[PDB]
């Protein structure tokens, strides 16, 4: 009947051709419009084999978001493979619009509607669509924003839990607000605010689920070990101006009987960064007197397990990120491309 295949998909979006927004601009070409009648076809009682970590769709979306950024975000100068280039860096509007991924005639996407499913193995409630759903290409570190949500319980995805060089995606069944502000009247100084009471509820249940995977083992959160500020800081984006957030106050082992509320963590803009599109560094300009502000939905955490838990009785976990494919893996887990007649 049907068969696993790696075809070339196309993108669909509810873009607007008039708006000069980078996302609308890039999605006005490369994408087609958008299906107003997306046909979902419940596969009777079939059972299929998914694997979110060997999914070609992630590589195709990776390429798309790559080509979105380094063709529509203007870098003052980029330094990479033994070369330096010059360009103009005009400031732009920036808001990620949902992108649907679509199979050409001769192919369909199988979809998993298993309420609690960790992107590997059997599915059971197999469905079939000719296009994925509204997936905002939100590029972030340590925290996934404006993404999907686990229908029922918190889910824990990892290609191999015993391999601690693999990233852990934790998929929340509860959205969390994150208000990040770059006021008017220091220039580069931003701050971020998150309902501490609400937030600590989520974390408590996240540690409880993580404990479920680890035979009742004491769960510890520690700030990231070392490396490029892009992974040690929750580094996301706002109105084209890259923020960098210190999440140490966030993963607070104490605040788990009294504690408090409004958690306020530092965060700051950067003009030089490390491109995620390739190994290299990138020059950019500062803002201009605007009250730069984004609210975002926390929908998951990028985590890393240590390797001194062969002893003790406590497993430590550190904020992660940097592998941007993983962001795309957190939304493309329930899909896989299949070839029919």
């Amino acid at each position, epitope marked *: 009947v049907w068969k696993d295949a790696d075809t070339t998909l*196309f993108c669909a979006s509810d873009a607007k051709a008039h708006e000069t927004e980078v996302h609308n601009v890039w999605a*006005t070409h490369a994408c*087609v419009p958008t*299906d*107003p009648n997306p046909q979902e076809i419940h596969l009777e009682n079939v059972t299929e084999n998914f694997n979110m970590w060997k999914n070609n769709m992630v590589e195709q979306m990776q390429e798309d978001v790559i080509s979105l950024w380094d063709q529509s975000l203007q870098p003052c100068v980029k330094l990479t493979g033994g070369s330096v280039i010059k360009q103009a860096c005009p400031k732009i509007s920036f808001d990620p619009i949902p992108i649907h991924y679509c199979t050409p*005639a*001769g*192919y*369909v996407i199988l979809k998993c509607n298993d309420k609690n499913f960790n992107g590997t193995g059997p599915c059971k409630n197999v469905s079939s669509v000719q296009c994925t759903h509204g997936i905002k290409p939100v590029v972030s570190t340590q925290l996934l924003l404006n993404g999907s949500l686990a229908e029922e319980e918190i889910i824990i995805r990892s290609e191999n839990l015993t391999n601690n060089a693999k990233t852990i995606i934790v998929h929340l069944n509860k959205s969390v607000e994150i208000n990040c502000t770059r006021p008017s009247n220091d220039i580069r100084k931003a701050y971020c605010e998150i309902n501490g009471t609400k937030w600590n509820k989520v974390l408590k249940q996240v540690t409880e689920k993580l404990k479920e995977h680890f035979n009742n083992k004491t769960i510890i959160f520690q700030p990231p070990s070392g490396g490029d500020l892009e992974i040690t800081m929750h580094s996301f984006n706002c109105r084209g101006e890259f923020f960098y957030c210190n999440t140490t106050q966030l993963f607070n082992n104490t605040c788990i009987k009294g504690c408090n509320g409004t958690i306020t963590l530092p965060c700051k803009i950067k003009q030089i960064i490390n491109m995620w599109q390739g190994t290299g560094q990138a020059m950019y300009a500062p803002p201009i007197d605007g009250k730069i502000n984004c609210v975002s939905n926390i929908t998951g955490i990028l985590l890393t397990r240590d390797g001194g838990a062969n002893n003790t009785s406590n497993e430590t976990f550190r904020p992660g990120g940097g592998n941007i494919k993983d962001n795309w893996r957190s939304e493309l887990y329930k899909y896989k491309v299949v070839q029919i007649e």
Partner: antibody, heavy 123, light 108 residues
């Protein structure tokens, strides 16, 4: 097997509304959408709109939305079509059509067409 | 987005000749393109779907080819029966846009 039967040919006056019908058979009228296409005087085909029987949500081409209204009666397996504020320009043949009968996605090409309904807009 | 441009809008060949109709799109749309023959005062009859795939019950002298934004219906050994009008349509989703059509007459 599968069959689509429209209403009888009609006549209306410059702005009057017209309600064409389309009684399907040979398939479970639930699962498959119903599409409306029209052919004017010495012109080509022009897709008008799509209608879903299971939901009742409808979409139209920009040239027609505001004037076309598609409804449905699941019990008689009959899709309806309704045009308002007509012109000498709207004198045309109206077909209903529907996709090939299959479970899989990607088969939304019109295999089954109606016999067509001529609608003369004239005083 | 998504504009289909069908050419020519008129064609004249003789029985046994080989004719070629062309459809050209703005952007790609995953080859959800069907070819219809509407015979003089008849109903449309989908000859070709999925860009290149032949619909059973129609002769094999009708073929579709091309991909992305360049498609072509070729009628290899033309016959008198084929005197009709041919349209290309997209069916990835709404709006299932039609081409402008191609009247085909026969020299004899």
């Amino acid at each position: 097997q599968v069959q689509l039967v429209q209403s009888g040919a009609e006549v209306q006056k410059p702005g009057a509304s017209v309600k064409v019908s389309c009684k399907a058979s040979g398939y479970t009228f639930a699962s498959y959408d119903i599409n409306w296409v029209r052919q004017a005087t010495g012109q080509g085909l022009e897709w008008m709109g799509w209608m879903n029987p299971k939901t009742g949500n409808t979409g139209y081409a920009q040239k027609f939305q505001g004037r076309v209204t598609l409804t449905r009666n699941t019990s008689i397996s009959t899709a309806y079509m309704e045009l308002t504020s007509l012109r000498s320009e709207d004198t045309a043949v109206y077909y209903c059509a529907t996709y090939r009968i299959i479970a899989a996605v990607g088969y939304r090409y019109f295999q089954y067409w109606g016999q067509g309904t001529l609608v003369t807009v004239s005083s | 987005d998504i504009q289909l441009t069908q050419s020519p809008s008129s064609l004249s060949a003789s029985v046994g000749d080989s004719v070629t109709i062309t459809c050209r799109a703005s952007q790609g749309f995953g080859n959800y393109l069907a070819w219809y023959q509407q015979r003089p005062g008849k109903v449309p009859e989908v000859l070709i779907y999925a860009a290149t795939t032949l619909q059973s019950g129609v002769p094999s002298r009708f073929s579709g080819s091309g991909s992305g934004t360049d498609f072509t219906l070729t009628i290899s050994s033309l016959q008198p029966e084929d005197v009709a009008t041919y349209y290309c349509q997209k069916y990835n989703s709404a709006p299932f846009t039609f081409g402008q059509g191609t009247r085909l007459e026969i020299k004899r």
